[PDB]
Design a protein around this nucleic acid. Structure first.
Ligand SMILES: Nc1nc2c([nH]c(=O)n2[C@@H]2O[C@H](COP(=O)(O)OP(=O)(O)OP(=O)(O)O)[C@@H](O)[C@H]2O)c(=O)[nH]1
Ligand SMILES: [Mn+2]
Ligand SMILES: [Mn+2]
Ligand SMILES: [Mn+2]
Ligand SMILES: [Mn+2]
Ligand SMILES: [Mn+2]
Ligand SMILES: [Mn+2]
Ligand SMILES: [Mn+2]
Ligand SMILES: [Mn+2]
Ligand code: NA
Length: 326
DNA sequence: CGGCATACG
DNA sequence: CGTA
DNA sequence: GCCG
């Protein structure tokens, strides 16, 4: 079992969901308490289980696996022996976990904001609505549309949204393209949002594109919330039969020179990309982001025509998007 | 001991 | 800070 | 929490 998640295939459907979900509760809780290192370990351990070919039935099957130490092993041991881990259940049932999950699920609210509200005694969404002065415009939008934003986005929604984004993009710039990224490109059937990457084959023609796209969407009544810019984290008014629902949509524009790097970064998973960037820097001495791959000693950027090119320049076996579900 | 991904809005 |  |  390779130690980095970018060195192994992780399919969407795997064989250890019970174990991985328990470890991911501990990771989430570690985040709520401000320990990003513990969060990362528990996430990495859960991800290792997703990459295994068969169900773990015996604690012996963990020996030698990366990111399993005393704590993650004890969690698995108790789930195998008893079907429940006391620590996981305590966190699950705790007022702090439940409230931090509730608040951080809001668009515009992260851990530090949720923790402050928790410390102020706030506990419910209605508590927040009762104190609108304490909210940014982004948080106001997140709370206003929270019910819809909690409804899974389905493929039919994606296809309808792709059509209206393509229409606006084509009106704004002939020849520009729209690529579905995020979890749907990895094969997910559902999501919390839809992610789109926009470019143009002629370098530089995409300058100023995203404001023009947003204006065209806003004039068709499709925009409920949005913030020079190249990323827009939006809420769309998606038509439905006889009505509409709010959907989160992320739009990003990249020049075509950067498109493989942006496609790779925005296709995820989040853990896959953090692990790939860690691998790049720590094992290969190269700096990876959604713009490029930089060699800091020659002071040069690697020219890539595809995601495959990037994997190859990092000395990694290529993984298609459906195997990046780390 | 300390690192843990890396950027834009 | 928030978002990805 | 795990690891280089
Ligand atoms: N959520 C999230 N995405 C991130 C982070 N950093 C980062 O590069 N991304 C990239 O943004 C991509 C799209 O983000 P996303 O939150 O829409 O996640 P997703 O489509 O995989 O899952 P979803 O099904 O919940 O929408 C991810 O797939 C990930 O690679 C991060 O900290 N959080
Ligand atoms: Mn399998
Ligand atoms: Mn412990
Ligand atoms: Mn026991
Ligand atoms: Mn998404
Ligand atoms: Mn997104
Ligand atoms: Mn840029
Ligand atoms: Mn330490
Ligand atoms: Mn520690
Ligand atoms: Na949030």
């Amino acid at each position: 079992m390779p130690a980095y998640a970018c060195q192994r295939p992780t399919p969407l459907t795997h064989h250890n969901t019970g174990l991985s979900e328990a470890l991911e509760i501990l990771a989430e809780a570690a985040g709520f308490e401000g320990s990003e290192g513990r969060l990362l370990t528990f996430c990495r351990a859960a991800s290792v289980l997703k990459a295994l070919p068969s169900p773990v039935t015996t604690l012996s099957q963990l020996q030698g696996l990366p990111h399993f130490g005393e704590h993650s092993s004890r969690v698995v041991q108790e789930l195998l022996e008893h079907g429940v881990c006391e620590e996981v259940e305590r966190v699950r049932r705790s007022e702090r976990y439940q409230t931090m999950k509730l608040f951080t699920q809001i668009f515009g609210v992260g851990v530090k904001t949720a923790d402050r509200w928790y410390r102020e005694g706030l506990r419910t969404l209605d508590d927040l609505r009762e104190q609108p002065q304490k909210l940014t415009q982004q948080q106001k939008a997140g709370l206003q549309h929270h019910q819809d934003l909690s409804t899974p986005v389905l493929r039919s929604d994606v296809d309808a949204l792709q059509q209206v984004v393509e229409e606006a993009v084509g009106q704004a710039l002939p020849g520009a393209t729209v690529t579905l990224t995020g979890g749907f490109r990895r094969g997910k059937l559902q999501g919390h949002d839809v992610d789109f990457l926009i470019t143009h084959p002629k370098e530089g023609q995409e300058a100023g594109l995203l404001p023009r796209v947003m204006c065209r969407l806003q004039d068709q009544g499709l925009i409920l919330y949005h913030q020079a810019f190249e990323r827009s984290f939006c809420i769309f008014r998606l038509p439905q039969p006889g009505s509409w629902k709010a959907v989160r949509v992320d739009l990003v524009v990249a020049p075509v020179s950067q498109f493989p790097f942006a496609l790779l970064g925005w296709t995820g998973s989040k853990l896959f990309q953090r692990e790939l960037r860690r691998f790049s820097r720590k094992e290969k001495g190269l700096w990876l982001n959604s713009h490029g791959l930089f060699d800091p000693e020659q002071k040069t950027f690697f020219q890539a025509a595809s995601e495959e090119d990037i994997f190859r320049h990092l000395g990694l076996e290529y993984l298609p998007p459906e195997q990046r579900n780390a």
